[PDB]
Amino acid sequence: LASFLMQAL
Ligand SMILES: *C(=O)c1ccc(-c2ccc(C(=O)OCC)cn2)nc1
Ligand SMILES: *NNC(=O)c1ccc(-c2ccc(C(N)=O)cn2)nc1
Ligand SMILES: Cc1ccccc1C
Ligand SMILES: Cc1ccccc1C
Ligand SMILES: Cc1ccccc1C
């Protein structure tokens, strides 16, 4: 999940 949200950056 972290990756799925941090893709914003
Ligand atoms: C959430 O964005 C998230 C959580 C976990 C993973 C992920 C991707 C690949 C692996 C993997 O190859 O495991 C080998 C031990 C594990 N977890 N991606 C995204
Ligand atoms: N918010 N994330 C980004 O903007 C982002 C763009 C591109 C990449 C990335 C990572 C790894 C590779 C590679 N190993 O070829 C290419 N591009 N990460 C983040
Ligand atoms: C590597 C990967 C794949 C799918 C969604 C987000 C990210 C960071
Ligand atoms: C979609 C989502 C979920 C949890 C925290 C942040 C964001 C953008
Ligand atoms: C991480 C984030 C959050 C909201 C707008 C833009 C960006 C890059």
mmCIF file with all atom_site columns, all heavy atoms in Angstrom, unseen atoms left out:
data_model
loop_
_atom_site.group_PDB
_atom_site.id
_atom_site.type_symbol
_atom_site.label_atom_id
_atom_site.label_alt_id
_atom_site.label_comp_id
_atom_site.label_asym_id
_atom_site.label_entity_id
_atom_site.label_seq_id
_atom_site.pdbx_PDB_ins_code
_atom_site.Cartn_x
_atom_site.Cartn_y
_atom_site.Cartn_z
_atom_site.occupancy
_atom_site.B_iso_or_equiv
_atom_site.pdbx_formal_charge
_atom_site.auth_seq_id
_atom_site.auth_comp_id
_atom_site.auth_asym_id
_atom_site.auth_atom_id
_atom_site.pdbx_PDB_model_num
ATOM   1   N N   . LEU A 1 1 ? 0.812  -1.199  0.000   1.00 0.00 ? 1 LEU A N   1
ATOM   2   C CA  . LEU A 1 1 ? 0.000  0.000   0.000   1.00 0.00 ? 1 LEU A CA  1
ATOM   3   C C   . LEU A 1 1 ? 0.852  1.258   0.000   1.00 0.00 ? 1 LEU A C   1
ATOM   4   O O   . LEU A 1 1 ? 0.568  2.203   -0.737  1.00 0.00 ? 1 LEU A O   1
ATOM   5   C CB  . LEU A 1 1 ? -0.947 -0.001  1.205   1.00 0.00 ? 1 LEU A CB  1
ATOM   6   C CG  . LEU A 1 1 ? -1.831 1.249   1.317   1.00 0.00 ? 1 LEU A CG  1
ATOM   7   C CD1 . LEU A 1 1 ? -2.680 1.466   0.070   1.00 0.00 ? 1 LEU A CD1 1
ATOM   8   C CD2 . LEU A 1 1 ? -2.715 1.173   2.549   1.00 0.00 ? 1 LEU A CD2 1
ATOM   9   N N   . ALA A 1 2 ? 1.891  1.285   0.827   1.00 0.00 ? 2 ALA A N   1
ATOM   10  C CA  . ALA A 1 2 ? 2.780  2.429   0.863   1.00 0.00 ? 2 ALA A CA  1
ATOM   11  C C   . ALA A 1 2 ? 3.237  2.850   -0.558  1.00 0.00 ? 2 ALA A C   1
ATOM   12  O O   . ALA A 1 2 ? 3.211  4.003   -0.950  1.00 0.00 ? 2 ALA A O   1
ATOM   13  N N   . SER A 1 3 ? 3.665  1.862   -1.328  1.00 0.00 ? 3 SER A N   1
ATOM   14  C CA  . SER A 1 3 ? 4.111  2.121   -2.689  1.00 0.00 ? 3 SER A CA  1
ATOM   15  C C   . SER A 1 3 ? 2.976  2.669   -3.556  1.00 0.00 ? 3 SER A C   1
ATOM   16  O O   . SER A 1 3 ? 3.187  3.556   -4.382  1.00 0.00 ? 3 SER A O   1
ATOM   17  C CB  . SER A 1 3 ? 4.648  0.831   -3.327  1.00 0.00 ? 3 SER A CB  1
ATOM   18  O OG  . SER A 1 3 ? 5.800  0.403   -2.650  1.00 0.00 ? 3 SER A OG  1
ATOM   19  N N   . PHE A 1 4 ? 1.781  2.121   -3.374  1.00 0.00 ? 4 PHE A N   1
ATOM   20  C CA  . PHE A 1 4 ? 0.637  2.527   -4.130  1.00 0.00 ? 4 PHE A CA  1
ATOM   21  C C   . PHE A 1 4 ? 0.212  3.973   -3.874  1.00 0.00 ? 4 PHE A C   1
ATOM   22  O O   . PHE A 1 4 ? -0.416 4.631   -4.709  1.00 0.00 ? 4 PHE A O   1
ATOM   23  C CB  . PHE A 1 4 ? -0.586 1.599   -3.953  1.00 0.00 ? 4 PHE A CB  1
ATOM   24  C CG  . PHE A 1 4 ? -0.265 0.157   -4.180  1.00 0.00 ? 4 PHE A CG  1
ATOM   25  C CD1 . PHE A 1 4 ? -1.015 -0.806  -3.527  1.00 0.00 ? 4 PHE A CD1 1
ATOM   26  C CD2 . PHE A 1 4 ? 0.771  -0.269  -5.026  1.00 0.00 ? 4 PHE A CD2 1
ATOM   27  C CE1 . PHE A 1 4 ? -0.749 -2.158  -3.683  1.00 0.00 ? 4 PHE A CE1 1
ATOM   28  C CE2 . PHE A 1 4 ? 1.048  -1.621  -5.198  1.00 0.00 ? 4 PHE A CE2 1
ATOM   29  C CZ  . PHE A 1 4 ? 0.290  -2.574  -4.520  1.00 0.00 ? 4 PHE A CZ  1
ATOM   30  N N   . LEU A 1 5 ? 0.570  4.487   -2.701  1.00 0.00 ? 5 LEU A N   1
ATOM   31  C CA  . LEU A 1 5 ? 0.324  5.889   -2.377  1.00 0.00 ? 5 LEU A CA  1
ATOM   32  C C   . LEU A 1 5 ? 1.528  6.771   -2.692  1.00 0.00 ? 5 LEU A C   1
ATOM   33  O O   . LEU A 1 5 ? 1.363  7.871   -3.213  1.00 0.00 ? 5 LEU A O   1
ATOM   34  C CB  . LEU A 1 5 ? -0.058 6.047   -0.907  1.00 0.00 ? 5 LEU A CB  1
ATOM   35  C CG  . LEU A 1 5 ? -1.260 5.213   -0.457  1.00 0.00 ? 5 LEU A CG  1
ATOM   36  C CD1 . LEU A 1 5 ? -1.523 5.417   1.053   1.00 0.00 ? 5 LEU A CD1 1
ATOM   37  C CD2 . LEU A 1 5 ? -2.510 5.565   -1.305  1.00 0.00 ? 5 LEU A CD2 1
ATOM   38  N N   . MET A 1 6 ? 2.736  6.305   -2.352  1.00 0.00 ? 6 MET A N   1
ATOM   39  C CA  . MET A 1 6 ? 3.933  7.087   -2.641  1.00 0.00 ? 6 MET A CA  1
ATOM   40  C C   . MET A 1 6 ? 4.248  7.243   -4.126  1.00 0.00 ? 6 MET A C   1
ATOM   41  O O   . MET A 1 6 ? 5.083  8.089   -4.472  1.00 0.00 ? 6 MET A O   1
ATOM   42  C CB  . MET A 1 6 ? 5.189  6.739   -1.830  1.00 0.00 ? 6 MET A CB  1
ATOM   43  C CG  . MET A 1 6 ? 4.993  6.516   -0.373  1.00 0.00 ? 6 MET A CG  1
ATOM   44  S SD  . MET A 1 6 ? 6.487  5.818   0.363   1.00 0.00 ? 6 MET A SD  1
ATOM   45  C CE  . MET A 1 6 ? 6.040  5.907   2.111   1.00 0.00 ? 6 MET A CE  1
ATOM   46  N N   . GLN A 1 7 ? 3.576  6.512   -5.004  1.00 0.00 ? 7 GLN A N   1
ATOM   47  C CA  . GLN A 1 7 ? 3.745  6.746   -6.424  1.00 0.00 ? 7 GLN A CA  1
ATOM   48  C C   . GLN A 1 7 ? 3.396  8.194   -6.793  1.00 0.00 ? 7 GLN A C   1
ATOM   49  O O   . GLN A 1 7 ? 3.822  8.675   -7.850  1.00 0.00 ? 7 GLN A O   1
ATOM   50  C CB  . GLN A 1 7 ? 2.919  5.750   -7.236  1.00 0.00 ? 7 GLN A CB  1
ATOM   51  C CG  . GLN A 1 7 ? 1.419  5.926   -7.100  1.00 0.00 ? 7 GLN A CG  1
ATOM   52  C CD  . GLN A 1 7 ? 0.622  5.052   -8.059  1.00 0.00 ? 7 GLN A CD  1
ATOM   53  O OE1 . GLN A 1 7 ? 0.886  5.008   -9.280  1.00 0.00 ? 7 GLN A OE1 1
ATOM   54  N NE2 . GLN A 1 7 ? -0.385 4.371   -7.509  1.00 0.00 ? 7 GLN A NE2 1
ATOM   55  N N   . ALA A 1 8 ? 2.620  8.880   -5.945  1.00 0.00 ? 8 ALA A N   1
ATOM   56  C CA  . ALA A 1 8 ? 2.349  10.300  -6.115  1.00 0.00 ? 8 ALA A CA  1
ATOM   57  C C   . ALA A 1 8 ? 3.638  11.122  -6.320  1.00 0.00 ? 8 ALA A C   1
ATOM   58  O O   . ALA A 1 8 ? 3.670  12.163  -6.982  1.00 0.00 ? 8 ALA A O   1
ATOM   59  N N   . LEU A 1 9 ? 4.720  10.621  -5.714  1.00 0.00 ? 9 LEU A N   1
ATOM   60  C CA  . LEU A 1 9 ? 6.030  11.272  -5.742  1.00 0.00 ? 9 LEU A CA  1
ATOM   61  C C   . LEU A 1 9 ? 6.991  10.580  -6.707  1.00 0.00 ? 9 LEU A C   1
ATOM   62  O O   . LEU A 1 9 ? 8.205  10.773  -6.678  1.00 0.00 ? 9 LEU A O   1
ATOM   63  C CB  . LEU A 1 9 ? 6.649  11.278  -4.346  1.00 0.00 ? 9 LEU A CB  1
ATOM   64  C CG  . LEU A 1 9 ? 5.906  12.116  -3.315  1.00 0.00 ? 9 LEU A CG  1
ATOM   65  C CD1 . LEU A 1 9 ? 6.268  11.665  -1.882  1.00 0.00 ? 9 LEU A CD1 1
ATOM   66  C CD2 . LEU A 1 9 ? 6.206  13.567  -3.518  1.00 0.00 ? 9 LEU A CD2 1
HETATM 67  C C1  . LIG B 2 . ? 1.719  -1.314  -1.098  1.00 0.00 ? 1 LIG B C1  1
HETATM 68  O O1  . LIG B 2 . ? 1.867  -0.396  -1.858  1.00 0.00 ? 1 LIG B O1  1
HETATM 69  C C2  . LIG B 2 . ? 2.595  -2.549  -1.325  1.00 0.00 ? 1 LIG B C2  1
HETATM 70  C C3  . LIG B 2 . ? 2.849  -3.453  -0.306  1.00 0.00 ? 1 LIG B C3  1
HETATM 71  C C4  . LIG B 2 . ? 3.678  -4.544  -0.624  1.00 0.00 ? 1 LIG B C4  1
HETATM 72  C C5  . LIG B 2 . ? 4.163  -4.655  -1.897  1.00 0.00 ? 1 LIG B C5  1
HETATM 73  C C6  . LIG B 2 . ? 5.089  -5.792  -2.248  1.00 0.00 ? 1 LIG B C6  1
HETATM 74  C C7  . LIG B 2 . ? 5.553  -5.895  -3.533  1.00 0.00 ? 1 LIG B C7  1
HETATM 75  C C8  . LIG B 2 . ? 6.434  -6.924  -3.849  1.00 0.00 ? 1 LIG B C8  1
HETATM 76  C C9  . LIG B 2 . ? 6.805  -7.770  -2.840  1.00 0.00 ? 1 LIG B C9  1
HETATM 77  C C10 . LIG B 2 . ? 7.789  -8.945  -3.075  1.00 0.00 ? 1 LIG B C10 1
HETATM 78  O O2  . LIG B 2 . ? 8.319  -9.130  -4.113  1.00 0.00 ? 1 LIG B O2  1
HETATM 79  O O3  . LIG B 2 . ? 7.995  -9.745  -1.917  1.00 0.00 ? 1 LIG B O3  1
HETATM 80  C C11 . LIG B 2 . ? 9.129  -10.620 -1.898  1.00 0.00 ? 1 LIG B C11 1
HETATM 81  C C12 . LIG B 2 . ? 9.420  -11.012 -0.421  1.00 0.00 ? 1 LIG B C12 1
HETATM 82  C C13 . LIG B 2 . ? 6.312  -7.591  -1.555  1.00 0.00 ? 1 LIG B C13 1
HETATM 83  N N1  . LIG B 2 . ? 5.479  -6.603  -1.302  1.00 0.00 ? 1 LIG B N1  1
HETATM 84  N N2  . LIG B 2 . ? 3.913  -3.752  -2.832  1.00 0.00 ? 1 LIG B N2  1
HETATM 85  C C14 . LIG B 2 . ? 3.141  -2.714  -2.579  1.00 0.00 ? 1 LIG B C14 1
HETATM 86  N N1  . LIG B 2 . ? 6.385  9.568   -7.503  1.00 0.00 ? 2 LIG B N1  1
HETATM 87  N N2  . LIG B 2 . ? 7.263  8.689   -8.125  1.00 0.00 ? 2 LIG B N2  1
HETATM 88  C C1  . LIG B 2 . ? 7.964  9.079   -9.302  1.00 0.00 ? 2 LIG B C1  1
HETATM 89  O O1  . LIG B 2 . ? 7.832  10.153  -9.786  1.00 0.00 ? 2 LIG B O1  1
HETATM 90  C C2  . LIG B 2 . ? 8.876  8.014   -9.859  1.00 0.00 ? 2 LIG B C2  1
HETATM 91  C C3  . LIG B 2 . ? 9.139  7.989   -11.214 1.00 0.00 ? 2 LIG B C3  1
HETATM 92  C C4  . LIG B 2 . ? 9.980  7.017   -11.683 1.00 0.00 ? 2 LIG B C4  1
HETATM 93  C C5  . LIG B 2 . ? 10.533 6.116   -10.775 1.00 0.00 ? 2 LIG B C5  1
HETATM 94  C C6  . LIG B 2 . ? 11.457 5.027   -11.273 1.00 0.00 ? 2 LIG B C6  1
HETATM 95  C C7  . LIG B 2 . ? 11.991 4.123   -10.361 1.00 0.00 ? 2 LIG B C7  1
HETATM 96  C C8  . LIG B 2 . ? 12.815 3.125   -10.828 1.00 0.00 ? 2 LIG B C8  1
HETATM 97  C C9  . LIG B 2 . ? 13.070 3.104   -12.199 1.00 0.00 ? 2 LIG B C9  1
HETATM 98  C C10 . LIG B 2 . ? 13.955 2.015   -12.824 1.00 0.00 ? 2 LIG B C10 1
HETATM 99  N N3  . LIG B 2 . ? 14.604 1.151   -11.916 1.00 0.00 ? 2 LIG B N3  1
HETATM 100 O O2  . LIG B 2 . ? 14.061 1.827   -14.003 1.00 0.00 ? 2 LIG B O2  1
HETATM 101 C C11 . LIG B 2 . ? 12.507 4.027   -13.029 1.00 0.00 ? 2 LIG B C11 1
HETATM 102 N N4  . LIG B 2 . ? 11.730 4.958   -12.556 1.00 0.00 ? 2 LIG B N4  1
HETATM 103 N N5  . LIG B 2 . ? 10.246 6.173   -9.479  1.00 0.00 ? 2 LIG B N5  1
HETATM 104 C C12 . LIG B 2 . ? 9.442  7.091   -9.010  1.00 0.00 ? 2 LIG B C12 1
HETATM 105 C C1  . LIG B 2 . ? 5.962  -0.243  -8.465  1.00 0.00 ? 3 LIG B C1  1
HETATM 106 C C2  . LIG B 2 . ? 4.518  0.190   -8.401  1.00 0.00 ? 3 LIG B C2  1
HETATM 107 C C3  . LIG B 2 . ? 3.552  -0.559  -9.073  1.00 0.00 ? 3 LIG B C3  1
HETATM 108 C C4  . LIG B 2 . ? 2.209  -0.207  -9.049  1.00 0.00 ? 3 LIG B C4  1
HETATM 109 C C5  . LIG B 2 . ? 1.807  0.922   -8.350  1.00 0.00 ? 3 LIG B C5  1
HETATM 110 C C6  . LIG B 2 . ? 2.756  1.683   -7.679  1.00 0.00 ? 3 LIG B C6  1
HETATM 111 C C7  . LIG B 2 . ? 4.103  1.341   -7.688  1.00 0.00 ? 3 LIG B C7  1
HETATM 112 C C8  . LIG B 2 . ? 5.077  2.202   -6.947  1.00 0.00 ? 3 LIG B C8  1
HETATM 113 C C1  . LIG B 2 . ? -5.841 7.307   -1.452  1.00 0.00 ? 4 LIG B C1  1
HETATM 114 C C2  . LIG B 2 . ? -5.211 7.515   -0.106  1.00 0.00 ? 4 LIG B C2  1
HETATM 115 C C3  . LIG B 2 . ? -5.427 6.621   0.954   1.00 0.00 ? 4 LIG B C3  1
HETATM 116 C C4  . LIG B 2 . ? -4.839 6.801   2.209   1.00 0.00 ? 4 LIG B C4  1
HETATM 117 C C5  . LIG B 2 . ? -4.011 7.891   2.422   1.00 0.00 ? 4 LIG B C5  1
HETATM 118 C C6  . LIG B 2 . ? -3.781 8.783   1.371   1.00 0.00 ? 4 LIG B C6  1
HETATM 119 C C7  . LIG B 2 . ? -4.369 8.617   0.105   1.00 0.00 ? 4 LIG B C7  1
HETATM 120 C C8  . LIG B 2 . ? -4.114 9.579   -1.017  1.00 0.00 ? 4 LIG B C8  1
HETATM 121 C C1  . LIG B 2 . ? 2.474  13.916  -2.541  1.00 0.00 ? 5 LIG B C1  1
HETATM 122 C C2  . LIG B 2 . ? 1.531  14.904  -3.133  1.00 0.00 ? 5 LIG B C2  1
HETATM 123 C C3  . LIG B 2 . ? 0.327  15.205  -2.500  1.00 0.00 ? 5 LIG B C3  1
HETATM 124 C C4  . LIG B 2 . ? -0.568 16.123  -3.038  1.00 0.00 ? 5 LIG B C4  1
HETATM 125 C C5  . LIG B 2 . ? -0.259 16.758  -4.228  1.00 0.00 ? 5 LIG B C5  1
HETATM 126 C C6  . LIG B 2 . ? 0.938  16.461  -4.850  1.00 0.00 ? 5 LIG B C6  1
HETATM 127 C C7  . LIG B 2 . ? 1.846  15.546  -4.329  1.00 0.00 ? 5 LIG B C7  1
HETATM 128 C C8  . LIG B 2 . ? 3.134  15.266  -5.038  1.00 0.00 ? 5 LIG B C8  1
#
